[PDB]
């Protein structure tokens, strides 16, 4: 009777809501990362290939996380980046370095096999069309239009000759002539590619910082902002946030003593409350940038993420980077 | 290397993020609903059991929807209800009317075989414990404190014979004596039962409206806010929003006329832009409560939901109730 669905765009929207909800007051959320568990999982926890057991999503699991909690750190907006799968043009160290499909988002100018414009950071492009000669995900369909009309994924047999370059047409269209067609999307500045992007992911600017400094992301020429309001994240189906947070022992010396056993758990709690002199006292949203677990109220807030890992030892004046992915 | 997970609380979290993002302003989100398609799917449609085609999530699809436009109603938060599956205790109209399982939320005082307190509305409870004897529903793992000491689903046998009544102890805990234990949650006002709930779902109040009017939801004697801060939706694992929006034909005496073949498509768009005269102009966000398919900047905002189904007739000053379920 009923035939409905939610679009790919909704996924990007749940991501933005999450990112945008972070702030202060009763309508916003405060996000904290917790670290804990100084006692071993088992005597083999330090051997290569060791996997610790999965955390348990139950009231017991939450209680356990709190009982072993050693410290907490407030997560700020600037610690969160929207990201998408990284696909480098011409990287002959991975399959299909010269073959792509409609909608693939490829990165150029990020390695010698990519080089196209000394003076520009990494450059990202979306494939708009491919050669008419190839193979369809649905084998029997040997015609591109037929393939695509039925919903098959066409993979061309004619390789991409040269990597796209420049910002293309007034519409961003680029025609290398090898039968491929590309659309310039944006640029990634070095401070970002160098410290925020990884082997598997690239950053895609949030709408606000984009609208704020179009030139920083080589976006000054874009016109689509007249309709999609600098919604680059929706244009590329971004639906994953990556945290880049830090644990500074300077703030938890009592747990970074010369021979401590390290920490093995990480979790994310939204809106934990502050500790209270008397249970019936008013609730206070924890907003300082860090807390000793005992200065927070036990079991308050909502534990939305739980992670167990092999131990990692903290030194008196060192810092541990914590990364975490949220797919929406 | 790592073993992590997103807890079920994250789903409620996303649902609350969405509900909380709706408002007025750039950072805030506006949301409109749409409908259309006078064009028939085909002859064999007005029949019975005619499953229409599945919409298309691509520019090609959003294209059809926009063109076949007709009307657009703005959605207010008051039109959104966090809901959960309705399981009335003793409803022999459905499977297992007397057997329950931990974490199942059950409604009481909703029918004669349910009655426990006249003058009050539906009372809701959560199954804390279930009877000893039972089949773990996974290999063996059968006994008492076992299929539990390893997170194994549990389906008992010594059926529930007595509905839980009252508000339990200082923690809402209740023990009938049939090997079942329950926790008092809240109460639904008669007006909400009639107008918001259905044979399928019951409404669970948002934290804010719960903090503002506790007694209205049989919540005045509550104590758990001292840690969960009125986060009832989290307690019952609510992760679905049910739209309560009406299409008022008196808001348009054009498409509503005797001939009228009807419409067949539903659509939700977020943050749409008010059509401009000069593209380069600064974009404007629609903040009215209604717009004509041409009054808006085509392809503006973001389309997050598409629905196709049989035809529906629109009268003069008639109002067809439009409903939609979003699952986070
Ligand atoms: Cl997707
Ligand atoms: Cl948002
Ligand atoms: Cl539990
Ligand atoms: Cl919990
Ligand atoms: Cl920040
Ligand atoms: Cl290749
Ligand atoms: Cl950085
Ligand atoms: Cl935004
Ligand atoms: Cl797109
Ligand atoms: Cl406390
Ligand atoms: Cl498309
Ligand atoms: Cl309202
Ligand atoms: Cl039963
Ligand atoms: Cl009923
Ligand atoms: Cl609220
Ligand atoms: Cl327009």
Curated annotation (Swiss-Prot), chains A, B:
Family: Belongs to the tevenvirinae baseplate structural protein gp8 family.
Pfam families, alphabetized: Phage-Gp8 (PF09215)
Ranges that cross the membrane: none
Gene that specifies this protein: 8
Top-rank lineage group of the source organism: Viruses
Disulfide bonds: 136-147
Any single Gene Ontology cellular-component annotation: virus tail, baseplate
Record has Amino-acid biosynthesis as a keyword: no
Protein name: Baseplate wedge protein gp8
Subunit structure: Homodimer. Interacts with gp7. Part of the baseplate macromolecular complex which consists of gp5, gp5.4, gp27 (central spike complex); gp6, gp25, gp53 (inner baseplate); gp7, gp8 (intermediate baseplate); gp9, gp10, gp11, gp12 (peripheral); gp48 and gp54 (proximal region of the tail tube).
Induction: Expressed in the late phase of the viral replicative cycle.
Keywords annotated in UniProt: Disulfide bond, Viral baseplate protein, Viral release from host cell, Viral tail assembly, Viral tail protein, Virion
Disulfide bond found in the keyword field: yes
Native organism: Enterobacteria phage T4 (Bacteriophage T4)
Subcellular location: Virion
């Amino acid at each position: 009777i009923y035939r409905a669905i939610v679009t790919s765009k909704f996924r990007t929207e749940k991501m933005l809501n999450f990112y945008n909800s972070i702030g202060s007051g009763p309508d916003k959320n405060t996000i904290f990362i917790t670290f804990g568990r100084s006692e071993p999982w088992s005597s083999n926890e330090n051997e290569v290939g060791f996997a610790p057991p999965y955390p348990t999503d139950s009231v017991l699991g939450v209680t356990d996380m709190w009982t072993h909690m050693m410290g907490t750190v407030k997560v700020l907006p600037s610690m969160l980046d929207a990201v998408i799968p990284r696909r480098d043009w011409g990287d002959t160290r991975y399959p299909d370095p010269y073959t792509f499909r409609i909608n693939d988002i490829v990165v150029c100018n990020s390695a010698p096999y990519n080089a196209t414009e000394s003076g520009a950071g990494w450059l990202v492009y979306r494939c708009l069309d491919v050669p008419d000669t190839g193979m369809c995900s649905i084998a029997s369909l040997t015609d591109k239009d037929e393939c695509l009309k039925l919903g098959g994924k066409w993979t061309p047999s004619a390789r991409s000759m040269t990597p796209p370059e420049g910002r293309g047409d007034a519409e961003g269209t680029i025609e290398p002539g090898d039968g491929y067609v590309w659309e310039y999307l944006f640029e990634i500045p070095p401070d970002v590619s160098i410290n925020r992007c990884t082997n598997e992911y690239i950053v895609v600017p949030w709408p606000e910082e984009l609208k704020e400094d179009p030139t920083r992301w080589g976006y000054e020429d874009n016109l689509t902002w007249q309709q999609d309001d600098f919604g680059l994240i929706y244009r590329v189906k971004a639906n994953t946030i990556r945290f880049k947070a830090y644990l500074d022992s300077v703030y938890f010396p009592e747990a970074a003593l010369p021979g401590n056993k390290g920490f093995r758990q990480i979790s994310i709690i939204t809106n934990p409350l502050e500790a209270k002199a008397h249970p019936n006292d008013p609730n206070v949203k924890a907003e300082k940038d860090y807390y000793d677990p005992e200065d927070l109220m036990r079991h308050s807030g909502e534990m939305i993420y739980m992670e167990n890992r092999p131990p990692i030892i903290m030194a008196m004046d060192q810092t541990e980077e914590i990364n975490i992915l949220f797919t929406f």
